[PDB]
Write a protein that binds this ligand. Structure first.
Ligand code: FE
Ligand code: FE
Ligand code: FE
Ligand code: FE
Ligand code: MG
Lengths: 422, 428, 424, 426
C-alpha cells in the first residue's frame, strides 16, 4: 500500500501542549519549574493565546533525554497548576499523543527521515550520483530558504519533453476543469514547456500566489504521518529529481514530472487546496489506524481520484494526470466506479504495483472537503485542530472558552452578511 | 491647528493599476495577454491567477505607471467593450473616475514605502549635533534600501543611545502596572523575556518582527520617516507596521517631536501582539484601501483617537492603550487624572474631532474593547464611498477586491467553514 | 409499470389564486380592494395581511374559481401595469402562463381534500363495501380544525389488527430503524397501540402534534400526488381510517389503518424525519407534473420503501416495509440491489407497486436526506421559493432576495441562541 | 409603585421535573416504575421523544405539594442511579429550585386566574353599581376561560361604545403624525377586517384570529392584572393576556387599569408585526425561570420598551409604546423636546426608576425592533438559569437546552442552513 509507518530519530520528539491563565507570578513559576529541571530557557517559548485573551501557550522542544523527569513536571503541571496537559511523543509511548508539528518551521526536524536494486537506473552511476546530489539539496534544505536551482542535462529534458508532450495532448479530454483551468498559467508564468523543466522555487512562488501552498524539497519517500501532517500547513513535500531516461514512461516513484504535472495544478486551486489541507489537519495526532485510513483516502482521492463534471467524469488524481497509460484507462468502461464514501473508502484494499481496478468518484472538491471534515470528527484525538495562516501555526481547540470566542466570531460574521444583503 | 493626517504625494512615474476578472473561454486569455504584450507592456507587469471564488474566472494583477498612460484608454476600451470585463482603474494621482491606488499584494508595499512627507528641522532638539544628523541619515539609508522579505539589518546602538533608552524604559515600566491596559501588561513580560526588552538593551527590529509574526502575524518594516496616511494605514491592512529604527536625541529623553524607536517598541509592539488589537488595526487598514482623501482624513483622526491616543474600558475602571500614552510618562499620568474629558467612542463624531499633536489631548474617547472598536470600524467603513469591498487573505498575503455578490459568497463560505469547525470541536 | 404517481384532476370550479404584494400608499389598498369589489368579487374572498419581511408591503390572498375567469385578465392587467405588482397566477388546470395551484394556508387543504375494484379482496362482500363508504363519508364530512370522529371497530376488525400487530412487532426490534423502535413504546403507552385495541385517529393526531407538530387528516381514498405531497408541506398527513379486509390480514394492494399507524406514525413523531418529509412537501408546491412524478418516486424510495444506514448495519424505515412482514424480512436479505441515495438518479428509478422492490436506496440519515431533497427542489422550475411558517400555519412564497434574507436572519438568530447556550 | 407584581402561589402550587433519558433496555420502564411505586400515578407524567437528541426522551411531570414527600428520593435516584440532569421547578421558589414556568402553551391555564374582589374605592366607577357588576361579568368570563376555546362575544352598550368612540377618535386623529410606521401600516387592516371603527367595539375572537394569521400571536382573556412572571411568560408562547372590559364612561381619557382600548389600540397593531412579535417573545423567553430580581429588570425593560417605548425612523422619532398609543395626552407629550431621552441600554434601563402614576420624564429610544430583540437576547444570557430556552412553534412547547449534545444539533442545524444559503447564492 501507499502507507509508510513513521519511524523515530535517535532522540525522537517530545512536545507539551498546555495553556495557563495569567496570574501574579505564574509565568515566572512555570519558567522556573522548567529551568530547575535542566530544561534551559531556549527550549520553552511562551506566546499569547489566539482565543483566550488571558492565557499563554507554551511550546516545548524536548527529546527522550528529558523523559526521566518529564513525568514529574507533568505531574506538577496538571495537579499543582491545574492545567490540561497533552503530551506529544514521536515514539508513541503509552499515555502519549502521536507527535505533530505545532509551527510550520518545526516541519524541518524530521523532514529528512527518508524511507533500488531493481530500479531501471541502478546500473547508471551518473544517475545514482545525480540522485545523491538532489538528496543532498533536500538534506540541507530548511524552511524559509529558496529552493536551490539545478540545471538539468539535455537527456533529462528530453525525458521531460516526452512526458510533457504525451500528457498535454491528453489533458484537454481527460483532466478535470481545474487542472485545465490553471495549466495555461503554469505554461505562461512557470516555464512549463516541452524544452524546459521548471524550477521548484519558481513553482513554489506561483503556488504561494494562488493558494498559499509551498513546495519543500525531499530526498525520497517520507512516512504517511510526516507527509500528511505537512499538508495541514499547505506544504507539499516535493521531489526534485526526474525519472531515468531509458524508460521515460514507466515509474514507480514520484519524479519532478509526477509532482509538477500531477499535483501542482490542483494545488493551485482554492477548493482543492482547502480539501488537501483538510486532510492534513485531520492527520495531526491521529492514531496509526487512522493514519492508515487517511493514507488510503489520499490514495483514492488526491492520488487516484475521479470527480463529477456535469454529466461526465474527469480525472483529478495525480497518479492519473502523470501516467498516460492509466489516465486513458480510468475513463474507459474497464474500471469499476464507486461513489466516494469515506467510511467505506478508508477500508478499501488497493495495490500500488498494478493499475487500480476501482476508483472512487467525488461529487466536487467542496463536497469532498466536507466529507473529509465529517470523517475527521470520527478520528480519535484528545482535542481538535484549526490552522492559523497568520502565524502559520496550528491551534488546538478543546477548552469551552475557546469555543465561545469562535462562536462569537461566527456570530459577528453572520451579522456582517445580514447587514450586507442591503 | 496641525493634525496627524498626511496627504499622499506621487513619485515621478506614479502608480496605475487595473483590477479586473475574465471568464474562461477559448482564446480569451491569449487575446488579453496579447493586447497587453503588443503595446510594449511585457509579461512581467501582467500576472494572471485563478479567482478564489468563481472557479471559472481569472484575476489579473497589473503593475503599470504613466509610461503606459498613452495606451491605457485603448486597452480599457477593448476590455470593457470588445471583451466585456468590468475594469476598475487605480491611479495614485486620483484623476476623476478613478479609484485612489492601493497595493494589492504585500510586496507592493515596497513601491511607495519611501514617499516621506531632507535635513531635519532646525527646531529639532538635535539640529546642532552633526553626529546625530549623520546617524539619522544612516538609518534613513537602511530603510531606503530595505525591500519586503529581507531580514531587518541589525545596528549596534551607542552607549549614550542605550542610556536614553534606559531612562525612558525605566520610568515608563515603573508605571505600566497601574496605568496600562490589560493587553499591554499581558504581553510586555513576554517581550522582556523573549525579545530582550531590558533597560540596558535596545531590541533589534528583526527579533521583534519575528515575535510579532509568532503572535498575530504582524511584521515590522523599517521606514526612514513619516509616510502618508494612505500608505501607512494601507500597510496595516496586511498587518505590516512601518517602524522607525532611530532613537531620540540624548539631551531631551522625554520630548520627541517625532516617533523614535521608543514610541514604536513601547507604544505599539505590545498591542500589535494581541489578536483583538491586531484584527482591530487591520480593519482600519482594510478601511483605508481606496478611500477618498477626505475619508483618509477621517480614518487618520479615528486612528489618532484610537490606536494613538485611545482609552479602553476594563470592567468598571479605565486604562490606556494609546501608543502616544504608553510612551509618554507625562501624558500617561495625565490621561487617567481628573483633568481630561472622556467621551464614549462613536466614530461618526470621533472622525470630525479637532486635535493638536503638540499639546496634551484635552479630550479622549473611551472604547468598550478592541472587538467593539473593530465592529465600529467596519460599520463606519460601510459608509465610505468605494466602488467595491476589500478583504485580506493571509494565505497569499494579497488583498481581495470584491463586489457585493462576491462579498456575500466569502462571508457565507467563511461562516460554513468556522461552523463546521465548531461542530467537530464541540464533541472534542 | 403502474407507479405511485397519481396525476391531479380538477373540480367543476377548480381553484384560482393570485399571489402579489403591494407597497403601502395613500389609497392603494382601497384601490386594489375596489377593483375586486367592482367586478363582483366581494371582500370575503380577498384577504390582506401585512408582509412579514417588507415592512412596507401587503400580502393578498385570493380565493377564486372559474366564475372569475372572465374577469381574471382585466384584474391581472391592472395589477401588473397600473399598480406595479408582480402577480403569480395559480390555476389547477395548469393553463400556460400559470403556476400549478397549491394551498397557501393550512385551511385551503379542505378545498381538494375530497378529490378521490373488481380485484379487491372485499368486492364480493357488500358489508365491507358499505363500511368503506362509511369511512369515506367520515372523511368527506371532515374539515380542518375539527376533532377526528371516533369510530368503534368490530371484533373481527380488531382481530385483523391483532394479527398484523403481533407479527410485525415481533420483528421490529431486529428489522426496524432506531427511530421506529424509539417511539413505538410511547405509542403503546399513550396511544393504545396494543394487540387488542385499534387506536383512534384523534388521539394519534394529538400525540403527533405534541411530538413534531404533525397532524392526521382523514381521507376517503387515494389523492393525487400533487395534493397529498402538498399536504405534507403543512405537516398534514392524509390518513385512512378503514382497515383491511379480514380474510387476508397479510395482503391489501392499498394502505389501511395498519399501514398508516404502524408504518407512518412512529417516524412522523421524530423531528429529523418530520423536517425531511416536510421538505418533500415544500418541494411539491407548484412543481410541474414531471417533477411531481419525480417527487412521488423519491417519496416511494424514501418514506415508503426506504432503507437507512445505522452504524455498520442497514435498517428499514419505509412505511411499506414496516407494515409488510413479508417484504420487511425480504428487504434486509442479500437479494435486493442497494444504491446510494442520489435524487437526480433516484427520481428516474423504475418501480412496480404490485411486486417486491428489486432495488432499494440507502440514505445516510434523515438530516442528510433533507439536504438532498432541498437541493433537488432547487432544480424544480418554479418562479419563486417556498418556506413554511408554523406560527400562522401558512406557506411563504419568496423570491431569491427574500429567501437570502430569511436564511441570513434565521441563521443569525440560531447562532445567537447557540452563543448564549454555550456559556451555560 | 412600579409595573412589577411579585408572583404569588396557589394553595397547591406547582412542581415540575425537567430531565431527559437516553434509551436503553428497561430505562423507560425504570423511570415510570420509580414514579408509580411512590404512588405518583401515570396520568401526571407524559413521556415524549427529545427534539434534538434523537436517542433521548423528555419527561413532562405535572405535580403539586402532595407529591413533595417522595420528590427528593426520586430526584436522588434520577440523578445518581439513572444519570440524568434533573432540574427541579417549584412555584414557591425554594432554594436549589428553579422558579416554575409553563412548559406547554396549555399549561398557561393553571395560574391564569391569580388576581393581583371589589374595586379600589378610588376607581372612577366605584359609585356605579352597574359598572361594578359589569367588571365582575368580564372577570367571570375570564375565570371560566381555558386555552383553546373561542373568546365569548359580548354585546357592548351604547355608553361603552361612546367611550370607545371618544378614545378612538382622539387617538386615531393623532396616530398618523405620532405613531410608528408599523402601527400605521397594520391599523387600516384592523379597521377593515376586525371592525376597528368609531361606532363599533371589536370582538376579542376576531382580533385573536387576525393576530394568528399575522404573527401567530393569540389573545387570552384575563380578569385583572397578573404577576409579572406569569404575563411575561405568556409572551414566550406569543400569548397576550388581554383584558375585555372598558374604562368608565365619566372619564374616557383617564385609566389606572388597562381597558379594551389600551389592549386593542396600543398593543394589537404591533403584535401583528413579525419583528415586534419576535421582540416581545424574546422578552418572554428571557423571563422563563428568571429570579425575582430579574423578573424586576424584565418588567422595567418591558415598561420602557413595549409599554412606553420610542423608536427611530430615519432622522425623526416616533412612539410605539402601548401606554403612549392609548393616551392622547402623553402621546403628544412624548414627541416634544420636553422629555429626557437616553439611548436604549438594558443594563442601565433595567435599573431605571419610574412612576406609573405620572407621565414618564424619561423615555428610552430603540434603534429598531430587531436591534431591541438582539439587546434582549444579550441581556438574557446574563440571567441566572441552569439552562437556556428556545420556543418550538410546531409543538407549542418550550425546549430547554443545557447539555453539549443539544448544542451539537443546534450547531448542525446552523451548519445546514449556512450550506443552504451557500447553494442559494449560486
Ligand atoms: Fe504523489
Ligand atoms: Fe505611532
Ligand atoms: Fe403510504
Ligand atoms: Fe399594557
Ligand atoms: Mg558600542
Amino acid at each position: 500500500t501507499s502507507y509508510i509507518e513513521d519511524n523515530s530519530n535517535q532522540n525522537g520528539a517530545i512536545s507539551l501542549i498546555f495553556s495557563l491563565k495569567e496570574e501574579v507570578g505564574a509565568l515566572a513559576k512555570v519558567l522556573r519549574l522548567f529551568e530547575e529541571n535542566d530544561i534551559n530557557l531556549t527550549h520553552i517559548e511562551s506566546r499569547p493565546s489566539r482565543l483566550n485573551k488571558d492565557e499563554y501557550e507554551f511550546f516545548t522542544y524536548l527529546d527522550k533525554r528529558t523523559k526521566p523527569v518529564l513525568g514529574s513536571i507533568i505531574k506538577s503541571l496538571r495537579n499543582d497548576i491545574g492545567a490540561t496537559v497533552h503530551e506529544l511523543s514521536r515514539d508513541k509511548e503509552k499515555n502519549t499523543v502521536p507527535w505533530f508539528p505545532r509551527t510550520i518551521q518545526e516541519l524541518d526536524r524530521f523532514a529528512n527521515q527518508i524511507l533500488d536494486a531493481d530500479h531501471p537506473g541502478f546500473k547508471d552511476p551518473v544517475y545514482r550520483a545525480r540522485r545523491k546530489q538532489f538528496a543532498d539539496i533536500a538534506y540541507n534544505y530548511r524552511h524559509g530558504q529558496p529552493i536551490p536551482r539545478v540545471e538539468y542535462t539535455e537527456e533529462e529534458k528530453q525525458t521531460w519533453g516526452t512526458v510533457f508532450r504525451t500528457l498535454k495532448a491528453l489533458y484537454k479530454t481527460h483532466a478535470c476543469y481545474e487542472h485545465n483551468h490553471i495549466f495555461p498559467l503554469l505554461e505562461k508564468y512557470c516555464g512549463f514547456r516541452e524544452d524546459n523543466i521548471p524550477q521548484l522555487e519558481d513553482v513554489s512562488q506561483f503556488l504561494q500566489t494562488c493558494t498559499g501552498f509551498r513546495l519543500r524539497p525531499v530526498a525520497g519517500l517520507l512516512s504517511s504521518r510526516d507527509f500528511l501532517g505537512g499538508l495541514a500547513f499547505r506544504v507539499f513535500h516535493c521531489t526534485q529529481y526526474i525519472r531515468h531516461g531509458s524508460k521515460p514512461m514507466y515509474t514507480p516513484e514520484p519524479d519532478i514530472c509526477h509532482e509538477l504535472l500531477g499535483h501542482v495544478p490542483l494545488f493551485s486551486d482554492r477548493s482543492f487546496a482547502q480539501f488537501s489541507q483538510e486532510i492534513g489537519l485531520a492527520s495531526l495526532g491521529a492514531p496509526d489506524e487512522y493514519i492508515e485510513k487517511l493514507a488510503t483516502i489520499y490514495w483514492f482521492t488526491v492520488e487516484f481520484g475521479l470527480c463529477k463534471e456535469g454529466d461526465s467524469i474527469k480525472a483529478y488524481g495525480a497518479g492519473l494526470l502523470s501516467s498516460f497509460g492509466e489516465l486513458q484507462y480510468c475513463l474507459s468502461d474497464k474500471p469499476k466506479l464507486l461513489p466516494l464514501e469515506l467510511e467505506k473508502t478508508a477500508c478499501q484494499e488497493y495495490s500500488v504495483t498494478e493499475f487500480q481496478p476501482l476508483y472512487y468518484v467525488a461529487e466536487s472538491f467542496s463536497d469532498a472537503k466536507e466529507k473529509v471534515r465529517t470523517f475527521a470528527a470520527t478520528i480519535p484525538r484528545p482535542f481538535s485542530v484549526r490552522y492559523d495562516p497568520y502565524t502559520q501555526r496550528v491551534e488546538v481547540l478543546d477548552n469551552t472558552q475557546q469555543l465561545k470566542i469562535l462562536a462569537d466570531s461566527i456570530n459577528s460574521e453572520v451579522g456582517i452578511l445580514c447587514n450586507a444583503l442591503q
